[PDB]
Every structure is written in C-alpha cells, then in structure tokens.
Symmetry: C6
C-alpha cells in the first residue's frame, strides 16, 4: 500500500478530472466509508432487539417497530453510498476500456475524439452523482421530520389491544451520527456543483 497507488485508485486515470474532486471528494468519500462502517458496527447493530415496547403480547413489538421506522438510517446510507459509487466506477471502467482499445490498435483526429467523448462522460457522471445525493437527502426529509430521534411513541395497532407507550434504544448517539452523515452528504453536494460549473467555465475559457 502506497499513497500514489491509493490516489490513482481514487482518481481513476482520468486526465480531465480537476483537483477539486481528485483530492477533496476522495477524502470526504473515504470519511463517509469510515463513519458508515464504524457506526453500524457500534451503535445501530441489530437495531431490532434494542427496540423495547411495553407489551407482553408476542409480535406487537415488531409490528410497532416496523410502523415507526420503515427503513433504517444505516441501510439507507449504505444504499446511497453504493448508488453514488456506481457512476464513478462506470467512468473508471470507460477509461480503462478505451486505453485497452488504443493498445490493441497500436499492436496491429481519432485521439481528439476519444478525449472529447471521455470529457462528456465525466461531466454526465458527476451530474448523476449530484442527482442521487439530492434524491437521498429528500428521502431523509420525507421519512423523518427531524434530525433528532423520538424517544417516546404511542402504539395503537393490531394486535395490540391498548395503545402502548414504547421506547427507542439509543437516541442520543444516533442523532450525532445522523448529523455527521448528513453533513458529509451536503459537502459532497456542494463539491459536485462546484466541480461541474468549474469544468464548464474552463471549457468556455478554452474556446
């Protein structure tokens, strides 16, 4: 493991990419990876047996948990992270494939066309990344009204005869980790807008 190799892996042999992404976006993406895995290993965990409802009836607790938290925070962040990654992986594959084609041509203008098409691919990939980030932020807003978790809820549903007051397990730390992940996603959003506009302005300067 060396820093040149790690940097190249994060970048992807993309000569069109600017410093902004290459350094800052790679760094904060690694930060997202770290915070995502440590927190899931640490606080949410199974995040089902921790949820406690005062009812002796079997099954009421699970139904009630399901009602109040349809999709978990950590699974949503993991899905967001994979879906964000796929565009960048696609661009890296495109460049790796194109250089291989060039090599096979050598073994047995056009180069300018290759350059231009790669530029367009990179721009569209960054746009898709931005769109995914924004959509996931909107889903977060829709699912949970507020950043802080709710400690006390009332549970009036089948098969629970009376409304039962029911409690969440570890709200305070989930709030902190939620804030961290949300801030990381926002930073990514602004970085991506800045990167796209920078590319367009540089292209205008060239012509």
């Amino acid at each position: 493991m060396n820093w040149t190799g790690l940097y190249t892996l994060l970048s992807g042999v993309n000569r069109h990419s600017t410093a902004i992404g290459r350094v800052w976006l790679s760094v904060i993406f690694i930060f997202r990876i770290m915070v995502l895995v440590v927190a899931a290993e640490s606080v949410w965990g199974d995040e089902k047996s921790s949820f406690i409802c005062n009812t002796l009836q079997p099954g009421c607790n699970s139904v009630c948990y399901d009602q109040f938290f349809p999709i978990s925070h950590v699974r949503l962040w993991s899905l967001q992270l994979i879906l964000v990654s796929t565009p960048a992986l696609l661009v890296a594959m495109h460049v790796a494939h194109q250089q291989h084609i060039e090599k096979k041509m050598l073994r047995l203008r056009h180069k300018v066309h290759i350059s231009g098409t790669l530029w367009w691919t990179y721009v569209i990939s960054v746009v898709f990344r931005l769109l995914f980030e924004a959509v996931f932020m909107y889903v977060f807003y829709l699912l949970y009204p507020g950043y802080a978790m709710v400690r006390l809820v009332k549970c009036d549903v089948y098969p629970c005869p009376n409304t039962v007051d029911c409690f969440v397990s570890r709200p305070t730390e989930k709030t902190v980790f939620t804030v961290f992940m949300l801030a990381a996603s926002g930073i990514c959003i602004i970085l991506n807008v800045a990167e796209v506009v920078y590319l367009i302005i540089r292209a205008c300067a060239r012509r």
Copy 2:
C-alpha cells in the same frame, strides 16, 4: 489494486468481447455483489427468529415459517449469482488455458482456428447466462405472487390447534431490496440479449 488490473479481471483477456459487456455488465454485476452482501448482513440476517407467530406451542412457529417461505430471497439471489458467474469463469479459464498451450508450442491456419473457436465459446457462454437469468426470474414469479411482502398470514397446520394469525418481521425494507435486485437482474437480461445480437450482426457485417 489498480483500475487496469480490476478491468482485466472483470473482462478476462477476451479479445472477442465487446465494449457493452466489458464495461456495463461488469459494473452492474459488481453492483449486484454489493447489494447482495450488504442487505444480507443488514436486514434478512438470520431471518428466522425475527419471524413471530402468536403460539406458545414449540415448533408451530418454525413449521409455519417453513410453509410460507420455502426458499429465502437472499439465498435464491446468491445461488443465482454463483450460477450466473460459472459460465464467465469457464470462458476465462478457456482463454487462459489456450494461451498457455500456445506458449508451450512456442517453446518447442491454426491461429485462425483458435480465434474462431474462442468466439463460439463466448457466444454460447453469454446465451447460457441469459437462460439462467430468465429461469431465476420465473422462479421468483412462481414462489411469490407479488413483489411486496405479506405482513399478516393465517396458519392452520399441524401441530397448531387453532389457526394463528402470524406476522413478518421487516417487510418494507425487504420490498425495497427486492426491487433493487430484480431491476439489476432485468438490466442484465437486456444487456445480454443486446450483446449476443450485436456479435451476430458484426459477424454478418464482416462477411
């Protein structure tokens, strides 16, 4: 780890393979791997103790779970993934073996024949991949009428004296992950049809 090595590993030193698979199919296959492992680690888990049936009788819960969910979603996707992989692995082995034979010949026309047989092998492998995907989609349709999971079921079987209303653990997220996996499989299906027809059309153009 470098992008050239990863790209070559995903492709397999197959000069006949087109850009379509090499880039897009590799990317979405990696996506399938990621979504499969994260979700199993996260939501399904043991996926047996989570299932709750209102009966104090021991064994009725397990019998009832077995009746309603013969084969799990995640195990079925994992089996599908392995079985899909085996054709591509076979083709990669074929090419690696043939180059070794060529080298041993060098140490101590035919080349054209090698090329043609490799082309035929690749086409048949892609066809087998398509067939496996379609068969697994059909099995999904047969096993579960609808994409959304059933929350409430009635359980009238031995050794359960009365029909017991019985509940599933985490349906909402299982629905989302089911949709993601199904969409990935469908994308693979269309990609594979397109790749095969592209190869045939290119061969026709050559002659």
Copy 3:
C-alpha cells in the same frame, strides 16, 4: 489478482495434465467451494437450536437430534472437499519440489525419467480423487435413505418418557442445496473417469 495466476494456481504447473481437468474440473471445484461456504453461512448455520422437539425436559431434544442426524450434511461435504483436495495438493508439491531439485543441479536420460515419474504420480492422484468421491457418495446413501429431508419424526428414547413428535427446521432449502452439492460431486466423478481413460488412450497412441 489476474486470470493467468489463478489458472496456474488451479492447474499447478503440470505439463502432463490435460485440458479437461485444467478447465472444467477447476471451474466446478470453485463452484463447490462457493456453494459450500454460502449455504453453511446461510441455511444450516448452527443447525442445532433450530431443531425443535416438543418436550419441556432438558436434554431430550439434543439426544434426539443426535440420534436422527449423526453427521451433518455440510460437515460431511467440507470433509469430502478437504480430503479430495489433498491429492492434488500433493501432486503440486511434487512438481514444485522436482523443479527446485533441477535448479540446484543446474547451479552446481534423467530428464526423461523425471517426466515419466511425474506422469505416473498424476495418474495415481486422479485415481485417488475418484475413489474418495465414490466413497463419500456411498456414505451419503447409507446415512440418509432419500435426498429430501424428513420434517416429522417420532422420538422414543431415554430420557424422554413418551414418544415425542419432533420437527426439522428448514427442510425445503436443505433439499435444494443437497441436490446441488450431489450433482457437483457426480460431475466430478464422471470428469475424473474421463480424464484417466483419456490419459491412458493417449499413452497408447504415443506407443
């Protein structure tokens, strides 16, 4: 990780080995590895607490489980896999050792003798592999009359005062995975017979 390295590792720098094993047997052996690990991680698991017997008496459940399933399917397949591997590992060690001896001779006819003895070693190793496969198939037949698992059993043994009807946990999926593993083992058996007879016929053709 590259395909040439993986292919060489699976083969073992054995110039006498034919295409049959090198490609097909390596592929289906990798398939056996994958199916063995995924299924054990997934369905059998601890495969003891899942077994449920209707008796409140402590210890009767474990005694009864032990009576009906002396050796588990997955442990038996794992043992089979290790024992099958050891011959091939032995042959790989033999070739690696012999090339080292040749190098030390260089540093400080016979070559033909080396070739012949290596050929004989390979043939005997393949024969041993075939024998191990057949023996394990016979043990499977002896232990379990049928491929499908038994859901309901009657348990009349100490310290269980009455015969208790007792249930298996997840039979339907265990049946499917059993079929997959058995088919893989059979394919290996036929491949091995074919490989040995091919070597003998080629030797006859040479002379």
Copy 4:
C-alpha cells in the same frame, strides 16, 4: 510488508515534515489504533446488555442507561480518531496530486511555489489536528466529571415508578483503558504543539 513501505505510508512523501511527527506521532497513532480496537473487542463489547438495573419493568433499564451514558467512550474515541486522521489524509492526497500534475507537465520559479504552498498546507493541517484533539478532550471533561466510572447510580425517571439503584458492568478495566486512551491523546497534543513551533522556528532561522 516492509518497514520502508510502512514508514512511507505513515509519513506520506512529505519532504517538509520533520522527524518529530514522522517517527513519534506515527508510532503513538498506531498505538492508539491498537488500543482502540483491542479494548472494544474485549471489554465494552455490546456494552448495553451488560448494564443491569434492578427493575422487572421492560424498557426502564434502557431509558436509564441512555440517561447516564449519552455517548459511549469507545465510539467517541473512534470518531475522534477518524476526524483526526482526515487532515493528514488530505495532505497526503495534496502531495500525491501535485506530483502527478508535475509528471503530466513533464510529459508535454514554479517549483519553488509548489514547495511553499505544500509547506503552508502541512502547517495548517497540523493546526487542525491539534484543534480536534483539544475539542475532544473538552467533550470528555464535560460528559464525565471523573476518569473513574460510577458503579452505583439512582434512577428516578419514567416509566420507573420508584428510584431504582442500578449498577455498571465492568468499571475497573474501563477506567484503565480510559486512562491509556487519554494519555495517548495528550501526548499527541504536546507533540503537535512542538511540531508546529519547530517548523516556525526553522523557517525563521532560514530567513
């Protein structure tokens, strides 16, 4: 794995960095990593079921645990460690990116400017590291009045009808590991002040 590679990875190809950090800070940071992971694997663990409150009422124990320990020690140290790392990772990315730009220039004064800007980046990164360390120490002081853990607490909150005397699981070892981590963080603080002042004094000596 070799010592030159590990040393370069810890340092980051930063010619401006002094011996102080390169050796001592790398060593004690590795020590922090080791102590953090071993202790979490060992003593804190799930650190929730271990907490015992004398109440048969379900949910009172979790509410009470949450009140007394809002954020765990180990999660706080892990977050501190990630957040401390991010600056150094950023500087390593900056240098790796700049050398790549220089290479692309070669393929197709300024060098002095590159050197100076890298120096400024390193100084600011070390300052940020110091600030993060100090902030986390302050949070430790605020959250817990004393280094030693409290064995006995009184718990008078909803839904617990009477104040219940409630006990912590493993205080003595948590105290020891707390002391170790705190001492490591303090050593880092002093090292960082010394490194920054050394750089400034050396710059003054140069001019």
Copy 5:
C-alpha cells in the same frame, strides 16, 4: 499466490532438508490446519452451552462439565499445532539470519562450517518436533480412556444435591474428527522418525 512461493514458504530455503518432509510433511500439516479450523468452526463451537445436565440449580451444570472435560480436544490440538510449528519456524529464522550475515560479509572453510551447523540445527529441530507429537499423544491417552465420547455420565458433586444423569451434545461427529486428527498426528510421527533416520544414513553414506 503461486505454487513455487507456497512450496518455498513451507520448506524454508533449507538445502539440507530431504524430499520426505518438504512434500509429505508440508501436505499433511496443511491438512491438519484445515481439519482443525473447519471442525472448530463447525462442531465444537462454544462447546459449553451445548452440554446439558438435568438440574435446575444454577452452576451445577458448569461444575459438572468442568469435572468431566478438563481440557477440550480442539484447544489441545491447537496448542499442539502451535508448539509443533515453533521448531520449524526457528530453523527457518536461523537460515534467513545466516544468509543475511553472509550478505553483509560480502558487502564489506567458513562456508563449510555454516553448512554443518545448519545441518545439526535441522536434525535437532526434527527431533524436538517428534518429541512434542509423542507427548501430546500421551496426554490424549491419559485424559480420555477411549476415542469415542461418552454420551451418559453421572454427576455427584457440590452443589448438586442428587447425582444427576447428564448428557453430551454431539458425540458421533466429535468421534470422527478425533479419529482424523489422531491419524494425522500419527502419520507425522512416523514421517519424522523416517526423516531423521534417513538423514543419519545419508551422512554415514557420505563418510
């Protein structure tokens, strides 16, 4: 991973070592590693909660388990394996150190002396390995009269008021795995005697 590297790692750049060990002992040692890890992961497991004694009194079960099985089979095999390994590791270190000394001499008869001392070291190491194997076999004989495990035991000790009939969890498979490990250890014993006597006879032939 390549076969030459694996073979060299197993051997240890020891020119005095004979074919016997280099191939066969390496192979069966790898077999011991595999069988040890798979079985522990699979059957013994925690091997404490599985043990069931018919007593409602808390603590009687653990005391009784401790009385009947002082040291587990799997831990004993693991300790045997580590202790067996240490001699071979020591010899490998000796040769690696001596070649480094020779290189440092080159940078700035005796060679014959180096050869002889290395030969003596190897012989004594093999003798120590044999002794460790024999001692561990004797301990196995002492601890357990027979290879087959005991299903039923009587437990008359404090704090258990009456002698309780108490049962073992999974005896049949433990018997099989015990036989496998014992056979491997015996094979190692004979191999080691043969290797030592072969070295001595070859030395006599030389002189």
Copy 6:
C-alpha cells in the same frame, strides 16, 4: 509471503542487532501472538456470562464478578503485548527515517555518528522492553496470589443479602494457558537481559 521478508520485518533493518533477538526473540514473540489470540478466541471468550453465582437477584452476579476479577488475564496480556511492541516499532521507525534522510542527502564523520546514535537507541529500547515485562509480571503477582484459578468463592456484598457461594466457569484450561503465557514472558525477560549484556561486552571488546 517469503521467509526473507518475514525475517526482515521481524528484525527491522537494524545492523546493530545481534543474532539472539533477531532469531529467538522474534520466534517466541510470534508464539506469544499465536497463544494470545487462539486462547481468547477459545476459552475466555466473553468470560462474563460464563461466571455463575447462585443468586436470583439481578446485578449481584456482575458486582461479584467485578470484585473478584478486576482485570482479566487476557486483556492484561494483550495490553502487555502492545506496550512491549511499541519500543521495537519506535526503533524500526527511527532506522527507516534515518535511511530516508541519507537518501535525500545523496539526491542533493557524519555516517559514524549515525551509526553510534542508532546503537544507543537500540540499547535503550531493549532496556525499556525489559522494564515493561518486569512490571507486568509484578502486576500479575499482585492481582492473583496463585497461578491456579479459584473455583469456589464467597460473595458478601451489596446488593446480595446473604453471602452466596459462587463458581468460576473453566478454571483448569485457564491455568494451563496462564502457565504458557507466563513462561513466554519469562523467557523474554532472560533473553533481553542477555542481549543487553552481550551488546555491552561486545562494545568493551571493540575498545
């Protein structure tokens, strides 16, 4: 993985280090690593639920366990091992840093001074290692009067109304593993004294 690389990693490119450490201390340190991890995975485990006290009152068992075993054996050995390692890691960092400085000088007597300072660093590091070992042995003596574990204890503390006789889980194997670890630490102590005195005597011989 090769023996030269492993040997260099264990040694650390230290030309002043003698054969004694390089071979024997590396070997027995690897032995300490192995015995530490296997035993913790195997016998101690969670080492809390295994402890059984005859009291139905919740919390009395944990309080009593805490009183009798303030710090666990395995955590203490792990801490000892990390703390022992840090000096050697520091020396390795020092040498790696110094060679890098020499290279940067080459790119753009003193050498004798470098040699001498490195010698002094190595001697002081070995002394610190010896001191850490001795301190940890003393702590072992203080915490536990005897090597063998205590099976039966009496527990008279809050909130336990009567003194309860309370039992340890697996004493016999903990005794064996304790003896092994203690013997390893002692061997290290003697080795370290011998190494330091050997260096001093050799220096006297030089002058």
